[PDB]
Design a protein around this ligand. Structure first.
Ligand code: A1ISR
Ligand code: NAG
Lengths: 30, 255
């Protein structure tokens, strides 16, 4: 319940999905 | 999901799939928020104009599925509903205002590398992230196009990253009175990019990764739209935060 949002095969294994850089980069500009 | 690409393995562990018992037909998408609470859209369960008035015993859910085709024992799971809670002030009559519904699993589910709950936003994350221009994630097994033909239903989970649209542009796209409980997202005619949730994707989770803790939060629920991926039209999603009050009053009284 306190490990929400942290995907086991990505955020917890220190990995990014193929497209989350888009979501992060939309916060600055592009 | 229109203009979506096949998902990676375990990329949306909260993704829940709403099926009907008899017939064994896929009704909607949904999201896992706790170890026994699932979140979907209200019209997926109650929409009178199409004779939709489902109960607990009418349907089931499936979790941890990657390939909609071949069943994957051990990793995926099926579950029965103990109760269904539809928002009392869900206004299907006019516009699907307050379009949201919760479902309590008969027995709680165990988390794995492929079944994991999404987080729900606080005031700060919602006010900081739900802004026009920023991009959120939509997932589902819906029609890849607005109108299917002979060759439409995907094999694995489909996913898009759609940017949020300003409230005025949203309420100018459609004739529906859009409320504070809904926001819209999608690209734009002179943006050279497409994407939209479609049939069967309703009720699924609209999520974003918080730059403050690198955690995925559910900002929206796939609510409605004029067809699928239409120029000058956008996908409308339930502003998950506004109704979070309700989400407490049920889970913190029927826990
Ligand atoms: N009825 C009202 O006047 C209020 S608006 C609903 C108007 C009629 N709906 C449609 O044309 C679409 C057709 C397929 N497009 C999608 O599924 C989505 C596109 C983007 C996103 Cl995001 S979902 N279906 C829905 O929207 C789901 C729905 C809504 C209401 C009842 C039953 C099902
Ligand atoms: C279905 O909604 C109707 C209105 O058509 C209402 O009669 C009924 O209570 C709902 N069905 C249930 C709770 O089984």
């Amino acid at each position: 319940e306190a490990d929400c949002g942290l995907r086991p095969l990505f955020e917890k294994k220190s990995l990014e999905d193929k497209t989350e850089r888009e979501l992060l980069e939309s916060y600055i500009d592009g | 999901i229109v203009e979506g690409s096949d998902a990676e393995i375990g990329m949306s562990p909260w993704q829940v799939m709403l099926f009907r018992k008899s017939p064994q037909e896929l009704l909607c998408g949904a999201s896992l928020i706790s170890d026994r609470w699932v979140l979907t859209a209200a019209h997926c369960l109650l929409y009178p104009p199409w004779d939709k008035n489902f109960t607990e015993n009418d349907l089931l859910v499936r979790i941890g599925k990657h390939s909609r085709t071949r069943y994957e024992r051990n990793i995926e799971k099926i579950s029965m509903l103990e109760k269904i809670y539809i928002h009392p002030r869900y206004n299907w009559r006019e516009n699907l205002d307050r379009d949201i519904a919760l479902m309590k699993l008969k027995k709680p589910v165990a988390f794995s590398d492929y079944i994991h709950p999404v987080c729900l936003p606080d005031r700060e994350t919602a006010a900081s992230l739900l802004q026009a221009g920023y991009k959120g994630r939509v997932t589902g097994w819906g029609n890849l196009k607005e109108t299917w033909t002979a060759n439409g239903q995907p094999s694995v989970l489909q996913v898009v990253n759609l940017p949020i649209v300003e409230r005025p542009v949203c309420k100018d796209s459609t004739r529906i009175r859009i409320t504070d409980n809904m926001f819209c997202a999608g690209y734009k005619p002179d943006e050279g990019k497409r994407g939209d949730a479609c049939e069967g994707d309703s009720g699924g989770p609209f999520v974003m990764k918080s730059p403050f803790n690198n955690r995925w939060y559910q900002m929206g629920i796939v609510s409605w739209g004029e067809g699928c991926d239409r120029d000058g039209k956008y996908g409308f999603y339930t502003h998950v935060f506004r109704l979070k009050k309700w989400i407490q009053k049920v889970i913190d009284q029927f826990g």
